[PDB]
Ligand binder design. Structure first.
Ligand SMILES: Nc1ncnc2c1ncn2[C@@H]1O[C@H](COP(=O)(O)OP(=O)(O)O)[C@@H](O)[C@H]1O
Ligand SMILES: Nc1ncnc2c1ncn2[C@@H]1O[C@H](COP(=O)(O)OP(=O)(O)O)[C@@H](O)[C@H]1O
Ligand SMILES: [Mg+2]
Ligand SMILES: [Mg+2]
Lengths: 92, 244, 121, 30, 11
């Protein structure tokens, strides 16, 4: 009974469809990357708020410490979210 | 290897290690630091475990192991600066002078726990700065008024996302000295979730010499830290705290 | 007592915020929560400074006599201290802020029920 | 209308570069 | 500007 083999072939076809879906996702992201944000743009985004503020020395040290670790973490870590949200409050 | 991107990130080891050159690290802390540094060298720099280890080592190498502020043992100018800021209050000034004299006799820095209680607006909170100036000790203040979370005193385990050591270790990192002056205001109005059982581990000469923090998980010697506590009335402070 | 607070802010041209502490029981509204906890936010005062975009707004603390128990009354001592406002500590920021320029107005129907540490400040 | 072909070509080039980098990393590991 | 919008819509 080659029905199991036919099902395995259908699963392989589904895997090929997943590969095509990944290729299409890359194709879409190629144009979707425009007008987006990244780890380097967020640094100046936070720093421009401090331009017009008379920031005390200790707050400046804390901000520099958080920005220093900001560039080390990746864009998807939960700790990255925690520090980004902390900076969003601290620099506002 | 030349075609692929390569970075000399291994310099982070001596980047951390240079902080301990002027410190006097106890053996038990140094062993943990060495094991953590060995673990860091194996983790990929993109791993979350690598970031946790890096934060742990950053906290460990920032504690001022063996650093002490140059305490002023001169009785005359210590009395002069105490009379400079506040009038009256003979008892507290006499207590501070006796503390300085005892520290001078034994030839080493001394830690004690003092509690100031009385009517509001008599100068209990303000004198903490004058005493710090007299002793040349670094000054720090945090209020336990309405304190219902133990995590402020003991911190959180580093397994959790974004754990921090807590108030005492933050103070140790900030003042960069192992003998600062701690002012714990409103000790008589501490809340419950129970922080009152956590202060007993801090305000006790018999166990504060090996204070264990949930984040660092390494004992630190707070026996030389001068603790000052402000209260409005004595009969509401917990009995174990009033005992010490 | 409540209506004059907005008129005072209009006359002084200060930003205005209304903080109804009456009946409140959660201390976390004043001093916030630690960064570790998920969904943590700073206290009400930090949001006041954030939304008003000024370090000297007019904060109206309504019904100080109706504060709850079982205790934000001790947390207010770090917020209404005539000289300790320069280092008010919020648990989320974990950074002292200078509130000495903020004009605090507190409303109370009866004087006798305010605690002495707050009544003297 | 014709921008789709240019976008697809750019995406294919980026994917090819990424796969070449992955293959080089695998060769280096071997 | 419309060409970029058309490509974005198609994607
Ligand atoms: N003996 C004193 N001499 C001079 N000033 C004093 C004295 N006692 C209190 N003060 C003044 O009172 C103010 C606040 O005192 P504080 O430390 O808040 O008292 P308490 O600790 O009872 O709340 C300070 O600015 C200080 O100048
Ligand atoms: N001096 C006044 N002049 C004009 N209107 C007033 C005056 N005092 C109170 N009011 C009116 O009373 C209303 C409610 O007052 P309210 O601020 O609630 O008093 P309280 O703060 O004592 O409860 C307001 O809408 C206001 O128009
Ligand atoms: Mg005081
Ligand atoms: Mg009213």
């Amino acid at each position: 009974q080659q029905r199991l083999g036919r099902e395995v072939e259908e699963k392989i076809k589904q895997t090929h469809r997943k590969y095509l879906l990944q290729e299409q996702l890359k194709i879409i992201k190629k144009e979707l990357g425009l007008e987006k944000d990244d780890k380097d743009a967020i640094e100046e985004k936070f720093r421009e708020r401090l331009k017009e503020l008379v920031v005390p020395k200790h707050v400046m040290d804390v901000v520099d410490e958080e920005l220093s670790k900001l560039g080390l973490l990746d864009n998807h870590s939960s700790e990255f979210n925690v520090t980004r949200n902390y900076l969003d409050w601290l620099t506002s | 290897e030349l075609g692929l991107e390569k970075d000399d990130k291994d310099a982070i080891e001596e980047k951390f290690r240079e902080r301990l050159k002027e410190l006097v690290v106890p053996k038990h802390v140094m062993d943990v630091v060495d094991e953590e540094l060995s673990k860091l060298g194996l983790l990929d720099n993109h791993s979350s475990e690598f970031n946790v280890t890096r934060n742990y080592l950053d906290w460990l190498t920032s504690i001022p192991w063996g650093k002490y502020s140059n305490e002023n043992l001169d009785l005359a100018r210590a009395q002069a600066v105490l009379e400079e800021d506040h009038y009256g209050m003979e008892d507290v000034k006499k207590r501070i002078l006796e503390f300085i004299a005892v520290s001078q006799l034994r030839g080493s820095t001394q830690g004690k726990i003092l509690c100031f209680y009385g009517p509001p607006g008599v100068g209990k909170t303000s004198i903490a700065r004058s005493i710090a100036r007299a002793l040349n000790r670094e000054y720090f203040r945090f209020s336990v008024g309405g304190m219902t979370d133990v995590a402020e005193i003991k911190g959180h385990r580093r397994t959790y996302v974004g754990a921090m050591p807590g108030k005492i270790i933050q103070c140790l990192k900030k003042t960069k000295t192992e003998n600062p002056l701690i002012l714990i205001d409103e000790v008589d109005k501490i809340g419950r979730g129970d922080p009152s059982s956590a202060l007993l581990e801090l305000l006790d000469p018999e166990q504060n010499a090996n204070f264990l923090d949930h984040y660092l998980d390494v004992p630190v010697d707070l026996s030389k830290v001068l603790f000052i506590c402000t209260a409005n009335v004595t009969d509401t402070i917990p009995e174990p705290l009033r005992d010490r």
